[PDB]
Scaffold this active site. Structure first.
Site, PDB file in Angstrom:
ATOM      1  N   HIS A 194      58.990  37.257  42.371  1.00 59.33           N
ATOM      2  CA  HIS A 194      59.658  36.682  41.204  1.00 59.33           C
ATOM      3  C   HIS A 194      59.204  35.264  40.980  1.00 59.33           C
ATOM      4  O   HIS A 194      59.350  34.725  39.887  1.00 59.33           O
ATOM      5  CB  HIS A 194      61.168  36.721  41.404  1.00 59.33           C
ATOM      6  CG  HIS A 194      61.945  36.162  40.256  1.00 59.33           C
ATOM      7  ND1 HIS A 194      61.645  36.452  38.943  1.00 59.33           N
ATOM      8  CD2 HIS A 194      63.019  35.339  40.225  1.00 59.33           C
ATOM      9  CE1 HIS A 194      62.495  35.826  38.151  1.00 59.33           C
ATOM     10  NE2 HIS A 194      63.340  35.146  38.904  1.00 59.33           N
TER      11      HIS A 194
ATOM     12  N   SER B 250      55.662  39.848  37.625  1.00 57.00           N
ATOM     13  CA  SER B 250      54.828  41.025  37.830  1.00 57.00           C
ATOM     14  C   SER B 250      53.535  40.952  37.043  1.00 57.00           C
ATOM     15  O   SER B 250      53.411  40.159  36.116  1.00 57.00           O
ATOM     16  CB  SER B 250      55.598  42.282  37.447  1.00 57.00           C
ATOM     17  OG  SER B 250      56.776  42.406  38.217  1.00 57.00           O
TER      18      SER B 250
ATOM     19  N   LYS C 289      63.856  52.804  31.964  1.00 52.56           N
ATOM     20  CA  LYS C 289      62.589  53.370  32.426  1.00 52.56           C
ATOM     21  C   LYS C 289      62.635  53.694  33.916  1.00 52.56           C
ATOM     22  O   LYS C 289      62.144  54.745  34.346  1.00 52.56           O
ATOM     23  CB  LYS C 289      61.445  52.406  32.118  1.00 52.56           C
ATOM     24  CG  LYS C 289      60.104  53.080  31.923  1.00 52.56           C
ATOM     25  CD  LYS C 289      59.146  52.178  31.171  1.00 52.56           C
ATOM     26  CE  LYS C 289      57.725  52.703  31.241  1.00 52.56           C
ATOM     27  NZ  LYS C 289      56.768  51.800  30.547  1.00 52.56           N
ATOM     28  N   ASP C 290      63.249  52.816  34.713  1.00 53.42           N
ATOM     29  CA  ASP C 290      63.422  53.078  36.134  1.00 53.42           C
ATOM     30  C   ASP C 290      64.401  54.215  36.370  1.00 53.42           C
ATOM     31  O   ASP C 290      64.231  54.988  37.314  1.00 53.42           O
ATOM     32  CB  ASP C 290      63.885  51.808  36.844  1.00 53.42           C
ATOM     33  CG  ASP C 290      62.745  50.848  37.127  1.00 53.42           C
ATOM     34  OD1 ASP C 290      61.651  51.034  36.552  1.00 53.42           O
ATOM     35  OD2 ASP C 290      62.945  49.899  37.909  1.00 53.42           O
TER      36      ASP C 290
ATOM     37  N   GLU D 222      51.946  64.125  60.884  1.00 51.53           N
ATOM     38  CA  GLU D 222      52.280  64.583  59.547  1.00 51.53           C
ATOM     39  C   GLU D 222      51.273  63.952  58.564  1.00 51.53           C
ATOM     40  O   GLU D 222      50.552  63.015  58.914  1.00 51.53           O
ATOM     41  CB  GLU D 222      53.763  64.280  59.277  1.00 51.53           C
ATOM     42  CG  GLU D 222      54.387  64.755  57.960  1.00 51.53           C
ATOM     43  CD  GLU D 222      55.872  64.439  57.869  1.00 51.53           C
ATOM     44  OE1 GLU D 222      56.409  63.836  58.822  1.00 51.53           O
ATOM     45  OE2 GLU D 222      56.501  64.795  56.852  1.00 51.53           O
TER      46      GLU D 222
HETATM   47  C1  HEM Z   1      68.972  53.329  58.840  1.00 48.87           C
HETATM   48  C2  HEM Z   1      68.740  54.489  58.236  1.00 48.87           C
HETATM   49  C3  HEM Z   1      68.319  55.707  58.960  1.00 48.87           C
HETATM   50  C4  HEM Z   1      69.015  56.429  59.880  1.00 48.87           C
HETATM   51  C5  HEM Z   1      70.400  56.150  60.398  1.00 48.87           C
HETATM   52  C6  HEM Z   1      68.199  57.513  60.278  1.00 48.87           C
HETATM   53  C7  HEM Z   1      68.657  58.437  61.222  1.00 48.87           C
HETATM   54  C8  HEM Z   1      67.928  59.557  61.544  1.00 48.87           C
HETATM   55  C9  HEM Z   1      68.348  60.590  62.399  1.00 48.87           C
HETATM   56  C10 HEM Z   1      69.665  60.666  63.124  1.00 48.87           C
HETATM   57  C11 HEM Z   1      67.351  61.505  62.454  1.00 48.87           C
HETATM   58  C12 HEM Z   1      67.374  62.771  63.268  1.00 48.87           C
HETATM   59  C13 HEM Z   1      67.879  63.949  62.439  1.00 48.87           C
HETATM   60  C14 HEM Z   1      66.704  64.768  61.975  1.00 48.87           C
HETATM   61  O1  HEM Z   1      66.080  65.424  62.770  1.00 48.87           O
HETATM   62  O2  HEM Z   1      66.356  64.769  60.685  1.00 48.87           O
HETATM   63  C15 HEM Z   1      66.298  61.048  61.639  1.00 48.87           C
HETATM   64  C16 HEM Z   1      65.118  61.745  61.464  1.00 48.87           C
HETATM   65  C17 HEM Z   1      64.049  61.247  60.733  1.00 48.87           C
HETATM   66  N1  HEM Z   1      64.002  60.113  60.029  1.00 48.87           N
HETATM   67 FE1  HEM Z   1      65.513  58.795  59.839  1.00 48.87          FE
HETATM   68  N2  HEM Z   1      67.022  57.475  59.627  1.00 48.87           N
HETATM   69  C18 HEM Z   1      67.026  56.408  58.813  1.00 48.87           C
HETATM   70  C19 HEM Z   1      66.042  55.953  57.945  1.00 48.87           C
HETATM   71  C20 HEM Z   1      64.801  56.552  57.883  1.00 48.87           C
HETATM   72  C21 HEM Z   1      63.732  56.098  57.109  1.00 48.87           C
HETATM   73  C22 HEM Z   1      63.736  54.881  56.217  1.00 48.87           C
HETATM   74  C23 HEM Z   1      62.682  56.970  57.323  1.00 48.87           C
HETATM   75  C24 HEM Z   1      61.341  56.896  56.714  1.00 48.87           C
HETATM   76  C25 HEM Z   1      60.456  56.005  57.145  1.00 48.87           C
HETATM   77  C26 HEM Z   1      63.125  57.962  58.233  1.00 48.87           C
HETATM   78  C27 HEM Z   1      62.321  58.986  58.667  1.00 48.87           C
HETATM   79  C28 HEM Z   1      62.796  60.010  59.476  1.00 48.87           C
HETATM   80  C29 HEM Z   1      61.985  61.169  59.846  1.00 48.87           C
HETATM   81  C30 HEM Z   1      60.560  61.447  59.438  1.00 48.87           C
HETATM   82  C31 HEM Z   1      62.762  61.941  60.623  1.00 48.87           C
HETATM   83  C32 HEM Z   1      62.374  63.259  61.240  1.00 48.87           C
HETATM   84  C33 HEM Z   1      62.916  64.373  60.342  1.00 48.87           C
HETATM   85  C34 HEM Z   1      62.578  65.720  60.915  1.00 48.87           C
HETATM   86  O3  HEM Z   1      63.299  66.217  61.931  1.00 48.87           O
HETATM   87  O4  HEM Z   1      61.662  66.357  60.456  1.00 48.87           O
HETATM   88  N3  HEM Z   1      64.434  57.679  58.569  1.00 48.87           N
HETATM   89  N4  HEM Z   1      66.677  59.845  61.086  1.00 48.87           N
HETATM   90  C1  HEM Z   2      58.927  49.344  51.560  1.00 49.33           C
HETATM   91  C2  HEM Z   2      58.416  49.815  50.427  1.00 49.33           C
HETATM   92  C3  HEM Z   2      58.239  48.927  49.265  1.00 49.33           C
HETATM   93  C4  HEM Z   2      59.196  48.559  48.374  1.00 49.33           C
HETATM   94  C5  HEM Z   2      60.650  48.958  48.376  1.00 49.33           C
HETATM   95  C6  HEM Z   2      58.578  47.714  47.429  1.00 49.33           C
HETATM   96  C7  HEM Z   2      59.320  47.190  46.374  1.00 49.33           C
HETATM   97  C8  HEM Z   2      58.693  46.633  45.290  1.00 49.33           C
HETATM   98  C9  HEM Z   2      59.293  46.335  44.055  1.00 49.33           C
HETATM   99  C10 HEM Z   2      60.731  46.593  43.684  1.00 49.33           C
HETATM  100  C11 HEM Z   2      58.340  45.787  43.265  1.00 49.33           C
HETATM  101  C12 HEM Z   2      58.552  45.317  41.847  1.00 49.33           C
HETATM  102  C13 HEM Z   2      58.400  46.466  40.841  1.00 49.33           C
HETATM  103  C14 HEM Z   2      56.975  46.941  40.754  1.00 49.33           C
HETATM  104  O1  HEM Z   2      56.114  46.201  40.337  1.00 49.33           O
HETATM  105  O2  HEM Z   2      56.653  48.185  41.135  1.00 49.33           O
HETATM  106  C15 HEM Z   2      57.136  45.732  44.001  1.00 49.33           C
HETATM  107  C16 HEM Z   2      55.954  45.214  43.519  1.00 49.33           C
HETATM  108  C17 HEM Z   2      54.832  44.997  44.317  1.00 49.33           C
HETATM  109  N1  HEM Z   2      54.645  45.400  45.574  1.00 49.33           N
HETATM  110 FE1  HEM Z   2      55.977  46.433  46.659  1.00 49.33          FE
HETATM  111  N2  HEM Z   2      57.277  47.553  47.715  1.00 49.33           N
HETATM  112  C18 HEM Z   2      56.992  48.269  48.818  1.00 49.33           C
HETATM  113  C19 HEM Z   2      55.775  48.420  49.473  1.00 49.33           C
HETATM  114  C20 HEM Z   2      54.686  47.632  49.154  1.00 49.33           C
HETATM  115  C21 HEM Z   2      53.493  47.590  49.866  1.00 49.33           C
HETATM  116  C22 HEM Z   2      53.212  48.408  51.097  1.00 49.33           C
HETATM  117  C23 HEM Z   2      52.662  46.685  49.225  1.00 49.33           C
HETATM  118  C24 HEM Z   2      51.305  46.287  49.633  1.00 49.33           C
HETATM  119  C25 HEM Z   2      50.271  47.115  49.539  1.00 49.33           C
HETATM  120  C26 HEM Z   2      53.373  46.182  48.103  1.00 49.33           C
HETATM  121  C27 HEM Z   2      52.859  45.248  47.234  1.00 49.33           C
HETATM  122  C28 HEM Z   2      53.446  45.016  45.993  1.00 49.33           C
HETATM  123  C29 HEM Z   2      52.779  44.288  44.922  1.00 49.33           C
HETATM  124  C30 HEM Z   2      51.406  43.681  45.005  1.00 49.33           C
HETATM  125  C31 HEM Z   2      53.628  44.271  43.877  1.00 49.33           C
HETATM  126  C32 HEM Z   2      53.368  43.615  42.542  1.00 49.33           C
HETATM  127  C33 HEM Z   2      53.141  44.644  41.442  1.00 49.33           C
HETATM  128  C34 HEM Z   2      52.350  44.047  40.318  1.00 49.33           C
HETATM  129  O3  HEM Z   2      52.775  42.924  39.723  1.00 49.33           O
HETATM  130  O4  HEM Z   2      51.335  44.590  39.955  1.00 49.33           O
HETATM  131  N3  HEM Z   2      54.612  46.787  48.083  1.00 49.33           N
HETATM  132  N4  HEM Z   2      57.383  46.258  45.249  1.00 49.33           N
END
Ligand code: HEM
Ligand code: HEM
Ligand SMILES: CCCCCCCCCCCCCCCCCC(=O)OC[C@H](COP(=O)([O-])OCC(O)COP(=O)([O-])OC[C@@H](COC(=O)CCCCCCCCCCCCCCCCC)OC(=O)CCCCCCCCCCCCCCCCC)OC(=O)CCCCCCCCCCCCCCCCC
Ligand SMILES: CCCCCCCCCCCCCCCCCC(=O)OC[C@H](COP(=O)(O)OCCN)OC(=O)CCCCCCCCCCCCCCCCC
Ligand SMILES: CCCCCCCCCCCCCCCCCC(=O)OC[C@H](COP(=O)(O)OCCN)OC(=O)CCCCCCCCCCCCCCCCC
Ligand SMILES: CCCCCCCCCCCCCCCCCC(=O)OC[C@H](COP(=O)(O)OCCN)OC(=O)CCCCCCCCCCCCCCCCC
Ligand code: HEC
Ligand code: HEM
Ligand SMILES: COc1c(O)c(C)c(C/C=C(\C)CC/C=C(\C)CC/C=C(/C)CC/C=C(\C)CC/C=C(\C)CCC=C(C)C)c(O)c1OC
Ligand SMILES: COc1c(O)c(C)c(C/C=C(\C)CC/C=C(\C)CC/C=C(/C)CC/C=C(\C)CC/C=C(\C)CCC=C(C)C)c(O)c1OC
Lengths: 98, 41, 240, 76, 24, 49, 68, 55, 373, 184
Positions: free
Chosen positions: I194, I198, I220-221, I264
């Site tokens: 910000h 953007s 739009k979002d 994966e």
């Molecule tokens: C703080 C928030 C989150 C909590 C409390 C949480 C908790 C859990 C728990 C308890 C499981 C095991 C249950 C299962 O087998 O699906 C799980 C699985 C998993 N979570 Fe999360 N999670 C969180 C956020 C995320 C996020 C942000 C991601 C992505 C990066 C993620 C990716 C996964 C994946 C890939 C699995 C495996 C699913 C599978 O069994 O195929 N989790 N999570």
């Molecule tokens: C955790 C996942 C992410 C979230 C939640 C996130 C969130 C956001 C949000 C809300 C915006 C503003 C809206 C938009 O322009 O699309 C944004 C823009 C941007 N993000 Fe992320 N972002 C993530 C991952 C990343 C990653 C991995 C990169 C680096 C490769 C990145 C780089 C940028 C850039 C460069 C912009 C500016 C867009 C532009 O003005 O062209 N973000 N992101």
């Protein structure tokens, strides 16, 4: 080379939005100093051309073919002003180096 | 035009129409949808 | 690796909104109970999961009470076996996997609860394997306790061919041909690996109807609130 | 923030109220031509890399199969 | 001045009268 | 980089060198101590053990 | 009374097709080859896998219409 | 293998031929110079840990 | 309220470019996906047990006995897949339109990308299937590559000689705690942006044409959220296992190894690179660089135009880069045998040469064509 | 620098009154205690299992077999006690010196106090001792007092007829997740 440069100018596509070449430069510090040194009429035409290009990109349209920017016609207005910014910039850099 | 002036122009009424409609929509949607699913399988 | 890839069969649940045929799940549960339960286990499936799917409450209660299940330490401090309850899971064939190794010539019959989900192209694989005990060709020779099933990895599955035509009689009376039995047990194992298959597809149908209602309306709201700009006409009027 | 973003001059900007204008003016009327206009300005830059990805993918698959296919001359 | 030109036509945009506003 | 190939630039660095070494030294000592690296600490007579 | 497993009837009806009988001919030659060469490690799996692939493909095209 | 220490504890017996070839293997030419007997107290008996040096 | 000011300053009266396409939706989608994951993860955490005797049993209990527990579990898995789809398209938007010149935003982004990959890896380890256990051992083993302190580090993470309960429980704790750090890093990501606003697809200064966000880029979002929810629910309710592996539905057997080990699909590109380099260490490093090369990206911009809208040669090089990224994703899947290996080796060579060498040289050539250089 | 600007305005140069006594330390202590709790809680979470068969066994395994695991566990428990000591003295400072006229700060404070009490209650349920189980039943029963929807709410939270594994696991999830909401 001249005809291939015209073909690349058509392939770049900023002439279809009515832009000049110097409108498409990324505004770094030197580019903003060169833009600030422009006269008022050239600056106003540049801002209107940029606003029209942004509006056309918003509506996903282009200008009609008679309104495009002919490669031959494009004027490198910012260029003269830019060289100076770079020249001055380098001179200053050199002074510090030494 | 009457509807707008009656239930869609005052925001409070706008909400009322939305909530009430949603209350019944579920009944209709579920019923209609179920009919379709059953027919399919 | 080099393995026969089971073909695609026209399953009644193959379609995008197509549920399972529950009579086939009932017949496949009968096939598992009379044939497959001697070696394979179903640790994550209980009798109460069969209520409302293949059997009623009293039929599943009778099915659960047909078997005996050790259940808890007697006050006297010892184990005891009781008739199964709707809360009882399916009985183990063996108390531990080493007994399965000893009883099956060193091979371990895997849990068939998620077999369809755990085997690539399971439903097909299952059908193919159960119906793929073809004769080993020249050049290949298998030791005792092995069978040339092209589909099985290595084509050497310890499991002997368990479905001989008319192996068991379907209570429904549908001719118990080997195939009719393999298709029923593949449907059942499928159900086992996903008891919610039907419920989900109903959720997916409601989701498709709701998204078909909601996507053009939200698109229309966006195009309302974006029309203003999309009609904006800019004009440059240098004072000149 | 707004008010201090930029300096423009003499750029008049006309507009209409949302409810006063058709929601989808000539949507398919010009939309199709435009979408098609767009695709022809970008297809030569985009498509041929994915075309040769498809050829390399197929090639790899078939080559791999041939690789796996037993050498008839061998073992005889 | 400010009267040299008139608002550009929005006919391809404008729909086809308070009578209608209520509906619109 | 053009600007960094300079005469004063070099002078500055030369003047800055000693301090830089000191900082690396602190870190090195730090790492040895924090990790209880014994390969290095075994050399120190008292620290041994 | 032999209970006809529709799968068997579909299986020879599918073996009456042309790709299956060509692969069976290679299978035969292959197996004869392995049989003829008393000491060899050239199996017939690839041929056999091709024959089973074609045959079970056309079996799975039309098997399930005969199953209740 | 007996899963010793949470990893497959490969324990193997070798044949006259098995033992004969491994010795024939060129230790120097081996990726890892360790003659068969160098890793076994008994030629008929070889014991290994089942973790691929790779991953 | 003072907060309302902050509420407005970032979402209502924020001056946004009027001409940003649908690609600019994707980052907001990522934020929504993050919340969705957190919410679904919380409802997995009320029934999951991080014990090696009971983890698979708890997952099956979630799928079979908890009311709509299968729905929340498969929403969590396919939402992780949707997170990586939106992440890859967000990074591709940043690469194509020259948004990496916002250097602090880009670096906070690549930190977020590393954190999301670590979170997804440990989450995939969490159900304690056959595939999870062998996958964990594999990548944990990756660390052993470290020249001197590798063995210790691996053992530390494992918490023992080999991955076992010690790992599962600490992986549950770390997988729980990292998405909140991801949310805080995303707040820092939004702040560092910000300050600069953007970018637009033309790559020009859009200060002359900016509009509010509430009525123009909010609806739009909302529409993008609705479309992403449509794709997520047709992934969950119709094809719940097209992206996962079947071998994860077997319990973890340390004695039995699978015939082919994969992470994966979104880790595949990296997997390919790792496999390509003959040296173990080389693979690990290249793998890391694969992700890190992006961070390095803002120092490789040698053009006077920010975006690729008016740059056709670098557009061709960009689509060749997307092409061999898809090729590396395919190769990872293929087993180790000819000619998959050679493609992998080339594809990795072409990937690093296009990002490192070909794009700045092409930008110099493009500046020469416009009589700028 | 837009990340460092915050600190300069907030932690490095913020204009603070010159005459504030040691009581004004306590809130900062609370923040430190929060981190300490989170850090110790994270190192309890790498070995704790939220299963009613194994929760007490996992706690004893932490105290007896994990290297310095007794230290981290008793630091977590006595840090919860130190958190409530500093919280009570912070609230007493706010009551004595008229700091409640900062009304929004006071209301966000009492929300934080409710969240901290809920977190500590579910955390005390977590080791699954005799006292934890009877304590949980008691307060969960408190909810049943609700005039009309009480029974349902209690059963919901319990996740069953009576607190049992269903509760323990969801209490582990909620006790994990609430200190980050407390930090926000
Ligand atoms: C703080 C928030 C989150 C909590 C409390 C949480 C908790 C859990 C728990 C308890 C499981 C095991 C249950 C299962 O087998 O699906 C799980 C699985 C998993 N979570 Fe999360 N999670 C969180 C956020 C995320 C996020 C942000 C991601 C992505 C990066 C993620 C990716 C996964 C994946 C890939 C699995 C495996 C699913 C599978 O069994 O195929 N989790 N999570
Ligand atoms: C955790 C996942 C992410 C979230 C939640 C996130 C969130 C956001 C949000 C809300 C915006 C503003 C809206 C938009 O322009 O699309 C944004 C823009 C941007 N993000 Fe992320 N972002 C993530 C991952 C990343 C990653 C991995 C990169 C680096 C490769 C990145 C780089 C940028 C850039 C460069 C912009 C500016 C867009 C532009 O003005 O062209 N973000 N992101
Ligand atoms: C082609 C045939 C139709 C046609 O010719 O119409 C012209 C029209 C093109 O008109 P134009 O004058 O060239 O451009 C102005 C747009 O129409 C102005 O509208 P737009 O298309 O830019 O709309 C913004 C865009 C914004 O898109 C997003 O929000 C994308 C969000 C991220 C992707 C989705 C999330 C999941 C991603 C997973 C990967 O929304 C869409 O992409 C279409 C939404 C349709 C909803 C369902 C309607 C029924 O074609 C379309 O609009 C295509 C999209 C709708 C179909
Ligand atoms: C997919 C093809 C999408 C497409 O329609 O391509 C054409 C589009 C043209 O964009 P442009 O020339 O800027 O003009 C748009 C305004 N008229 O070009 C674009 O849409 C550019 C889109 C930029 C983001 C593309 C991301 C693709 C996926 C990349 C994944 C890998 C990213 C790197 C990972 C490491
Ligand atoms: C290019 C020659 C001239 C072509 C002229 C075409 C007619 C132009 C005039 C009529 C208008 C037709 C439509 C015009 C659309 C916009 C203009 C345009 O597309 O120009 C041609 C385009 C860009 O041209 P430009 O960048 O100016 O210079 C060409 C440099 N070769 O360039 C192209 O379209 C061709 C791009 C080919 C890209 C092939 C990539 C192959 C390699 C892919 C590898 C993928 C990964 C493989 C595995 C890697 C790992 C092992
Ligand atoms: C305990 C006694 C502490 C004490 O020293 O009391 C006297 C002290 C005098 O303070 P004052 O008159 O403002 O002068 C200070 C500068 N000379 O007065 C004070 O110290 C005021 C201290 C305010 C905070 C006291 C908190 C005591 C514990 C309260 C717990 C319950 C709080 C409310 C819970 C609901
Ligand atoms: C009822 C008709 C069935 C079905 C549908 C299946 N079986 Fe069995 N089975 C047995 C043994 C000892 C094994 C392991 C053999 C080995 O691993 O070498 C199996 C294995 C299976 C599988 C798994 C195949 C795989 O790729 O892992 C499947 C899908 C399968 N069977 C299906 C033993 C028996 C029985 C005792 C003689 C009988 C009865 C059944 N199985 C019955 C069935
Ligand atoms: C996100 C960070 C946190 C995590 C991961 C966490 C995790 C845990 C775990 C696993 C236990 C059980 C081990 C044990 O018996 O001590 C526990 C217990 C406990 N936690 Fe936390 N905790 C966290 C933050 C907090 C906070 C902020 C508080 C204070 C409000 C707190 C208060 C408690 C209490 C009182 C116990 C019971 C200790 C006892 O057995 O006597 N925790 N926590
Ligand atoms: C106009 O410029 C902005 C902008 O001002 C803001 C705040 C956002 C942020 C929008 C979102 C809703 C994304 C949410 C981001 C997070 C902080 C994720 C954190 C998640 C939580 C658990 C909370 C933008 O995406 C954006 O560009 C479109
Ligand atoms: C001068 O005015 C201030 C002030 O500017 C600040 C920022 C703090 C904040 C100080 C702290 C270190 C407390 C930490 C507060 C948190 C945000 C707790 C969150 C905890 C984390 C896990 C991080 C004050 O306590 C204070 O008055 C003394």
């Amino acid at each position: 080379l001249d005809g291939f440069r015209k073909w690349y100018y058509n392939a770049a596509g900023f002439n279809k939005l009515g832009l000049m070449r110097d409108d498409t430069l990324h505004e770094t510090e030197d580019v903003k100093e060169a833009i600030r040194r422009l006269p008022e009429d050239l600056y106003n035409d540049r801002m209107f051309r940029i606003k029209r290009a942004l509006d056309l990109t918003m509506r996903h349209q282009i200008l009609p073919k008679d309104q495009w920017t002919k490669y031959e016609e494009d004027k490198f207005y910012l260029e003269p002003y830019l060289k100076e910014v770079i020249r001055e910039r380098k001179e200053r850099e050199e002074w510090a180096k030494k | 035009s009457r509807l707008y002036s009656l239930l869609f122009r005052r925001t409070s009424t706008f909400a009322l129409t939305i909530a009430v409609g949603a209350l019944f929509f579920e009944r209709a949607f579920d019923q209609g949808a179920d009919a379709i699913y059953e027919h399919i399988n | 690796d080099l393995e026969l890839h089971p073909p695609s069969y026209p399953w009644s649940h193959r379609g995008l909104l197509s549920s399972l045929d529950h009579t086939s799940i009932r017949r496949g549960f009968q096939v598992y109970k009379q044939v497959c339960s001697s070696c394979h286990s179903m640790d994550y499936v209980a009798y109460r999961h069969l209520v409302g799917v293949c059997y009623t409450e009293e039929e599943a209660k009778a099915l659960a009470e047909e078997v005996e299940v050790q259940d808890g330490p007697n006050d006297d401090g010892e184990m005891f076996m009781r008739p199964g309850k709707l809360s009882d899971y399916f009985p183990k064939p063996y108390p531990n996997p080493e007994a399965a190794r000893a009883a099956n010539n060193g091979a371990l019959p895997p849990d068939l609860s998620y077999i369809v989900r755990a085997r690539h192209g399971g439903e097909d694989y299952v059908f193919s394997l159960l119906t793929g005990y073809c004769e080993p060709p020249t050049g290949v020779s298998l030791r005792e306790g092995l069978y040339f099933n092209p589909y099985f990895p290595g084509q050497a599955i310890g499991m002997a061919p368990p479905i001989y035509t008319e192996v068991l009689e379907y209570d429904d009376g549908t001719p118990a041909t080997m195939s009719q039995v393999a298709k029923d047990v593949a449907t059942f194992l499928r159900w086992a690996s996903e008891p919610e298959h039907d419920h989900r597809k109903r959720m997916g149908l409601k989701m498709l109807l709701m998204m078909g209602l909601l996507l053009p309306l939200t698109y229309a709201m966006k195009r309302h609130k974006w029309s203003v700009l999309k009609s904006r006409k800019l004009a440059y009027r240098p004072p000149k | 923030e707004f008010g201090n973003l930029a300096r423009i001059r003499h750029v008049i900007s006309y507009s209409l109220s949302p409810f006063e204008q058709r929601a989808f003016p000539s949507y398919f009327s010009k939309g199709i031509p435009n979408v098609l206009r767009r695709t022809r300005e970008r297809i030569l830059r985009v498509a041929p890399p994915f075309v040769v990805v498809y050829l390399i993918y197929t090639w790899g698959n078939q080559e791999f199969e041939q690789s796996k296919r037993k050498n008839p001359a061998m073992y005889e | 001045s400010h009267t040299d030109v008139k608002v550009p036509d929005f006919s391809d945009y404008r729909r086809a009268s308070k009578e209608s506003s209520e509906a619109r | 980089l053009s600007r960094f190939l300079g005469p004063r630039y070099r002078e500055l660095a030369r003047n800055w060198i000693p301090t830089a070494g000191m900082w690396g030294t602190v870190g090195a000592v730090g790492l040895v101590w924090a990790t209880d690296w014994r390969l290095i600490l075994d050399w120190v007579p008292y620290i041994n053990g | 009374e032999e209970l006809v497993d529709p799968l068997t009837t579909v299986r020879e009806h599918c073996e009456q097709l042309e790709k299956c009988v060509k692969a069976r001919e290679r299978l035969e030659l292959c197996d004869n080859r392995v049989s003829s060469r008393s000491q060899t490690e050239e199996d017939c799996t690839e041929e056999l896998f091709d024959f089973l692939h074609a045959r079970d493909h056309c079996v799975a095209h039309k098997l399930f219409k005969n199953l209740k | 293998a007996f899963k010793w220490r949470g990893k497959p504890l490969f324990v193997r017996h070798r044949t006259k031929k098995e033992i004969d070839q491994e010795a024939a293997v060129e230790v120097s030419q081996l990726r890892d110079p360790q003659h068969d007997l160098d890793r076994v107290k008994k030629p008929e008996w070889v014991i290994l840990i089942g973790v691929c040096t790779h991953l | 309220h003072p907060l309302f000011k902050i509420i407005n300053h970032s979402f209502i009266d924020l001056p946004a470019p009027s001409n940003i396409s649908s690609w600019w939706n994707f980052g907001s989608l990522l934020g929504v996906c993050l919340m969705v994951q957190i919410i679904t993860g919380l409802f997995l955490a009320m029934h999951y047990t991080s014990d090696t005797m009971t983890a698979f049993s708890s997952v099956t209990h979630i799928c079979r006995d908890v009311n709509y527990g299968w729905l929340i579990r498969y929403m969590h898995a396919n939402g992780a897949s949707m997170f990586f789809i939106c992440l890859f398209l967000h990074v591709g938007r940043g690469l194509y339109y020259g948004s990496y010149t916002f250097m602090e935003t880009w670096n906070i982004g690549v930190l977020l990308l590393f954190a999301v990959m670590a979170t997804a890896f440990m989450g995939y380890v969490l159900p304690w299937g056959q595939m999870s256990f062998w996958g964990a051992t594999v990548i944990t083993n990756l660390l052993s590559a470290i020249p001197y302190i590798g063995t210790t580090l691996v053992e530390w993470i494992w918490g023992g000689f080999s991955v076992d309960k010690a790992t599962l429980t600490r992986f549950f704790a770390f997988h729980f705690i990292l998405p909140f750090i991801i949310a805080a890093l995303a707040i820092v990501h939004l702040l560092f942006l910000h300050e600069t606003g953007s970018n637009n697809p033309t790559g020009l200064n859009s200060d002359a044409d900016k509009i509010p966000f509430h009525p123009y880029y909010t609806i739009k979002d909302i529409l993008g959220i609705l479309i992403m929810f449509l794709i997520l629910m047709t992934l969950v309710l119709f094809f719940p296992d097209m992206l996962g592996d079947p071998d994860n539905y077997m319990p973890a057997n340390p004695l039995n190894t699978p015939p082919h080990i994969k992470p994966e699909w979104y880790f595949l590109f990296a997997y390919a690179i790792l496999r390509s380099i003959p040296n173990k260490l080389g693979g690990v490093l290249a793998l890391i660089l694969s992700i890190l090369i992006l961070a390095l990206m803002p120092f490789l911009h040698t053009s006077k135009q920010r975006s690729l809208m008016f740059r056709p040669i670098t557009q061709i090089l960009y689509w060749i880069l997307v092409a061999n990224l898809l090729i590396l994703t395919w190769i990872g899947g293929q087993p180790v045998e000819h000619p998959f290996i050679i493609i992998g080796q080339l594809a990795s060579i072409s990937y690093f040469s296009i990002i490192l060498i070909l794009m700045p040289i092409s930008g110099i050539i493009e500046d020469k064509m416009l009589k700028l250089y």
